[PDB]
Design an enzyme around this catalytic site. Structure first.
Site, PDB file in Angstrom:
ATOM      1  N   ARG A 159      19.297 -20.368  17.479  1.00  0.00           N
ATOM      2  CA  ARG A 159      18.117 -21.165  17.146  1.00  0.00           C
ATOM      3  C   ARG A 159      16.939 -20.250  16.844  1.00  0.00           C
ATOM      4  O   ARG A 159      16.195 -20.474  15.892  1.00  0.00           O
ATOM      5  CB  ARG A 159      17.744 -22.102  18.308  1.00  0.00           C
ATOM      6  CG  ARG A 159      17.507 -23.549  17.883  1.00  0.00           C
ATOM      7  CD  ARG A 159      16.212 -24.156  18.439  1.00  0.00           C
ATOM      8  NE  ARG A 159      16.077 -24.044  19.892  1.00  0.00           N
ATOM      9  CZ  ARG A 159      16.245 -25.045  20.756  1.00  0.00           C
ATOM     10  NH1 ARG A 159      16.566 -26.262  20.332  1.00  0.00           N
ATOM     11  NH2 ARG A 159      16.072 -24.830  22.053  1.00  0.00           N
ATOM     12  N   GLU A 199      24.565 -15.320  -6.648  1.00  0.00           N
ATOM     13  CA  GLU A 199      25.397 -14.309  -6.008  1.00  0.00           C
ATOM     14  C   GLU A 199      26.894 -14.630  -5.964  1.00  0.00           C
ATOM     15  O   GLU A 199      27.645 -14.025  -5.198  1.00  0.00           O
ATOM     16  CB  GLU A 199      24.858 -14.014  -4.605  1.00  0.00           C
ATOM     17  CG  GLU A 199      23.520 -13.271  -4.648  1.00  0.00           C
ATOM     18  CD  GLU A 199      22.951 -12.952  -3.280  1.00  0.00           C
ATOM     19  OE1 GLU A 199      23.729 -12.844  -2.307  1.00  0.00           O
ATOM     20  OE2 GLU A 199      21.715 -12.790  -3.182  1.00  0.00           O
ATOM     21  N   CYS A 258       0.854  -1.182   0.000  1.00  0.00           N
ATOM     22  CA  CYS A 258       0.000   0.000   0.000  1.00  0.00           C
ATOM     23  C   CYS A 258       0.891   1.234   0.000  1.00  0.00           C
ATOM     24  O   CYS A 258       2.109   1.120  -0.083  1.00  0.00           O
ATOM     25  CB  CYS A 258      -0.891   0.011   1.242  1.00  0.00           C
ATOM     26  SG  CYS A 258       0.029   0.085   2.788  1.00  0.00           S
ATOM     27  N   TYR A 270      24.205 -18.184  11.416  1.00  0.00           N
ATOM     28  CA  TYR A 270      23.094 -18.005  12.345  1.00  0.00           C
ATOM     29  C   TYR A 270      23.633 -17.374  13.635  1.00  0.00           C
ATOM     30  O   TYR A 270      22.980 -16.520  14.243  1.00  0.00           O
ATOM     31  CB  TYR A 270      22.452 -19.363  12.665  1.00  0.00           C
ATOM     32  CG  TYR A 270      21.747 -20.015  11.491  1.00  0.00           C
ATOM     33  CD1 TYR A 270      20.423 -19.695  11.184  1.00  0.00           C
ATOM     34  CD2 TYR A 270      22.411 -20.934  10.674  1.00  0.00           C
ATOM     35  CE1 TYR A 270      19.772 -20.281  10.085  1.00  0.00           C
ATOM     36  CE2 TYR A 270      21.774 -21.520   9.573  1.00  0.00           C
ATOM     37  CZ  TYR A 270      20.453 -21.185   9.288  1.00  0.00           C
ATOM     38  OH  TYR A 270      19.813 -21.759   8.201  1.00  0.00           O
ATOM     39  N   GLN A 271      24.828 -17.806  14.040  1.00  0.00           N
ATOM     40  CA  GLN A 271      25.487 -17.310  15.251  1.00  0.00           C
ATOM     41  C   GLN A 271      25.897 -15.841  15.160  1.00  0.00           C
ATOM     42  O   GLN A 271      25.727 -15.091  16.120  1.00  0.00           O
ATOM     43  CB  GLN A 271      26.738 -18.144  15.565  1.00  0.00           C
ATOM     44  CG  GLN A 271      26.485 -19.570  16.047  1.00  0.00           C
ATOM     45  CD  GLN A 271      25.887 -20.463  14.980  1.00  0.00           C
ATOM     46  OE1 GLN A 271      26.249 -20.378  13.798  1.00  0.00           O
ATOM     47  NE2 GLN A 271      24.974 -21.340  15.390  1.00  0.00           N
ATOM     48  N   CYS A 288      17.162 -13.461   3.661  1.00  0.00           N
ATOM     49  CA  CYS A 288      17.236 -14.587   4.592  1.00  0.00           C
ATOM     50  C   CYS A 288      18.006 -15.754   3.974  1.00  0.00           C
ATOM     51  O   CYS A 288      18.467 -16.655   4.686  1.00  0.00           O
ATOM     52  CB  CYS A 288      15.828 -15.035   5.016  1.00  0.00           C
ATOM     53  SG  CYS A 288      14.641 -15.229   3.673  1.00  0.00           S
ATOM     54  N   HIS A 289      18.150 -15.741   2.650  1.00  0.00           N
ATOM     55  CA  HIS A 289      18.895 -16.798   1.975  1.00  0.00           C
ATOM     56  C   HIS A 289      20.399 -16.665   2.248  1.00  0.00           C
ATOM     57  O   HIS A 289      21.152 -17.616   2.044  1.00  0.00           O
ATOM     58  CB  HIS A 289      18.634 -16.770   0.460  1.00  0.00           C
ATOM     59  CG  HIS A 289      19.003 -15.476  -0.196  1.00  0.00           C
ATOM     60  ND1 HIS A 289      18.263 -14.324  -0.038  1.00  0.00           N
ATOM     61  CD2 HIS A 289      20.036 -15.152  -1.009  1.00  0.00           C
ATOM     62  CE1 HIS A 289      18.824 -13.346  -0.727  1.00  0.00           C
ATOM     63  NE2 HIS A 289      19.902 -13.821  -1.324  1.00  0.00           N
ATOM     64  N   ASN A 327       9.896 -13.963   7.752  1.00  0.00           N
ATOM     65  CA  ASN A 327      10.233 -12.903   6.804  1.00  0.00           C
ATOM     66  C   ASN A 327       9.144 -12.814   5.741  1.00  0.00           C
ATOM     67  O   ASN A 327       8.959 -13.743   4.960  1.00  0.00           O
ATOM     68  CB  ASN A 327      11.591 -13.189   6.152  1.00  0.00           C
ATOM     69  CG  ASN A 327      12.016 -12.104   5.166  1.00  0.00           C
ATOM     70  OD1 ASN A 327      11.508 -10.985   5.192  1.00  0.00           O
ATOM     71  ND2 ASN A 327      12.968 -12.433   4.310  1.00  0.00           N
ATOM     72  N   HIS A 367       4.158  -4.896   1.624  1.00  0.00           N
ATOM     73  CA  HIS A 367       3.653  -5.831   2.623  1.00  0.00           C
ATOM     74  C   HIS A 367       4.231  -7.240   2.504  1.00  0.00           C
ATOM     75  O   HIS A 367       4.670  -7.821   3.501  1.00  0.00           O
ATOM     76  CB  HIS A 367       2.121  -5.904   2.526  1.00  0.00           C
ATOM     77  CG  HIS A 367       1.473  -6.698   3.619  1.00  0.00           C
ATOM     78  ND1 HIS A 367       1.401  -6.253   4.922  1.00  0.00           N
ATOM     79  CD2 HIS A 367       0.858  -7.904   3.600  1.00  0.00           C
ATOM     80  CE1 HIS A 367       0.770  -7.151   5.658  1.00  0.00           C
ATOM     81  NE2 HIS A 367       0.430  -8.163   4.880  1.00  0.00           N
ATOM     82  N   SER A 426      27.743 -22.157  10.008  1.00  0.00           N
ATOM     83  CA  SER A 426      29.156 -21.820  10.189  1.00  0.00           C
ATOM     84  C   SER A 426      30.050 -22.946   9.646  1.00  0.00           C
ATOM     85  O   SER A 426      31.250 -22.757   9.449  1.00  0.00           O
ATOM     86  CB  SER A 426      29.460 -21.568  11.674  1.00  0.00           C
ATOM     87  OG  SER A 426      29.168 -22.709  12.466  1.00  0.00           O
TER      88      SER A 426
END
EC number: 2.1.1.63
Length: 166
Positions: A118, A162, A19, A104-105, A135-136, A127, A24, A141
């Site tokens: 976690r 990428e 919008c 993630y760490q 997020c991809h 997301n 969104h 690690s």
């Protein structure tokens, strides 16, 4: 207030919604695809929507200039209230560039809690705007690519796109 349009891409049809206050959601509808650059089904619409279509087109077809396209304002409940998920999604959007990956760490630490890897993994599930908020780019690690809301195949496709040797 909410307007929608679709856009064909190498990952299949994408459904975009937003919008005047902001984008969104970005939804992947079919995991079929096409490599030829395509325009949105319905042109124009709220400013955030037009910026999103321009951004995605550049992401897939003019990646060399992706850092130059503005991320539209976002309007979704996940961003309207304070939560660990919002903190994580915003840090990811701000910090991780095209071609870069983060564990993630590392993302948990950036969000103020090194022991919450976690919960960071769990936050990725919330997301509403995949690709745009990368997020991809959140991986293991160990070097492994990790889980993905859109499936392993799509995460690997994006990372390979990428520059990663996958």
């Amino acid at each position: 207030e909410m307007k929608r349009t679709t856009l064909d891409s190498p990952l299949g049809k994408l459904e975009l919604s937003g919008c005047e206050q902001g984008l969104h959601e970005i939804k992947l509808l079919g995991k079929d695809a096409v490599e030829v650059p395509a325009p949105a089904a319905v042109l124009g619409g709220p400013e955030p929507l037009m910026q999103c279509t321009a951004w995605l087109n550049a992401y897939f077809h003019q990646p060399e200039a992706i850092e130059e396209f503005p991320v539209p304002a976002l309007h979704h409940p996940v961003f309207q209230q304070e939560s660990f998920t919002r903190q994580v999604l915003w840090k990811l959007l701000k910090v991780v560039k095209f071609g870069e990956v983060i564990s993630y760490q590392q993302l948990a630490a950036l969000a103020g809690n090194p022991k919450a890897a976690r919960a960071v993994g769990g936050a990725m599930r919330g997301n509403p705007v995949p690709i745009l908020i990368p997020c991809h780019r959140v991986v293991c690690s160990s070097g492994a690519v990790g889980n993905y809301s859109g499936g392993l195949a799509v995460k690997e496709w994006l990372l390979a796109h990428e520059g990663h040797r996958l």
